[PDB]
Amino acid sequence: PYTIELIQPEDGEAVIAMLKTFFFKDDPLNTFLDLGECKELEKYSLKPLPDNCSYKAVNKKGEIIGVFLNGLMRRPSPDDVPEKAADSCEHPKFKKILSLMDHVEEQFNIFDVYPDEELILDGKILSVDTNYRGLGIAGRLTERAYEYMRENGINVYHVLCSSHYSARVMEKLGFHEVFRMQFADYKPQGEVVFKPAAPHVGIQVMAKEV
Numbered sequence: 001p002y003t004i005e006l007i008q009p010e011d012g013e014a015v016i017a018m019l020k021t022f023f024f025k026d027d028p029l030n031t032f033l034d035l036g037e038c039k040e041l042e043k044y045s046l047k048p049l050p051d052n053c054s055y056k057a058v059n060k061k062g063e064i065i066g067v068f069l070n071g072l073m074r075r076p077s078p079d080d081v082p083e084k085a086a087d088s089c090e091h092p093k094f095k096k097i098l099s100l101m102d103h104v105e106e107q108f109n110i111f112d113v114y115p116d117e118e119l120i121l122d123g124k125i126l127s128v129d130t131n132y133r134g135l136g137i138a139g140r141l142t143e144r145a146y147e148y149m150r151e152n153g154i155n156v157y158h159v160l161c162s163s164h165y166s167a168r169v170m171e172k173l174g175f176h177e178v179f180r181m182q183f184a185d186y187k188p189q190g191e192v193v194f195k196p197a198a199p200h201v202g203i204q205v206m207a208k209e210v
């Protein structure tokens with residue numbers, strides 16, 4: 001028995017405490033790198049909260065057992081000056097993750113897929129407590145966002161997945177692949193950076209039109 005609720009500003013510390021226990025340790029990229037203490041990822045996770053479309057799953061004791069942090073994403077302006085997120089990151093391990101994100105964006109622009117859309121919902125951080133996995137919480141978190149999308153005329157939900165394992169969860173929820181890149185093919189300076197276990201494969205960007 002759990003609720004799905006909007007994450008409030010006062011929830012920031014509790015959200016971070018939960019992510020530090022789970023996501024920071026068990027997202028496949030974070031585990032591969034042994035991310036450790038990472039204030040940059042705390043900052044990254046807190047950023048979308050004021051967009052008022054991030055959700056927490058909360059158990060009967062009032063503990064956060066899952067989150068899906070989402071932010072609105074806008075089509076680059078005609079006069080856009082594109083920036084690399086990695087350039088302002090001092091944490092060397094998190095810089096590798098941000099560099100991977102920058103690389104994906106250099107190769108693939110979600111706004112090219114949907115030329116008529118100005119605003120898209122971006123699913124940024126998805127994490128469920130281990131003891132509550134396999135119960136459909138990820139799906140219930142995701143589907144709460146559809147409510148927000150309906151209320152605001154947003155058609156597209158975009159979610160970059162860090163493993164085929166989580167891309168499959170999104171597929172079950174009605175998302176489809178829009179871009180993929182194998183870890184074995186990600187060689188920004190000529191050499192492989194990420195080498196997690198074979199079943200992870202690589203990143204897949206997933207999208208749903210609601």
Ligand SMILES: CC(C)(COP(=O)(O)OP(=O)(O)OC[C@H]1O[C@@H](n2cnc3c(N)ncnc32)[C@H](O)[C@@H]1OP(=O)(O)O)[C@@H](O)C(=O)NCCC(=O)NCCS
Pocket residue numbers: 022023026027028126127128129130132133134135136137138139160161162163166169172
């Ligand atoms: C990805 C994640 C959020 C999924 O959350 P979830 O609420 O467990 O999602 P689901 O209930 O749909 O379960 C997904 C699959 O996990 C498997 N599963 C079943 N029981 C499980 C358990 N006790 N523990 C882990 N996985 C389990 C099943 O394959 C299940 O699919 P199915 O129920 O359709 O057969 C969760 O695994 C997680 O936090 N992973 C680590 C962080 C991460 O990778 N986040 C996503 C980044 S894109």
Ligand SMILES: CC(=O)NCCc1ccc(O)c(O)c1
Pocket residue numbers: 027028029030041097123124125126127159160161162
């Ligand atoms: C939908 C989702 O949770 N995507 C995760 C992408 C990501 C973000 C930050 C990290 O540190 C990381 O390993 C992976």
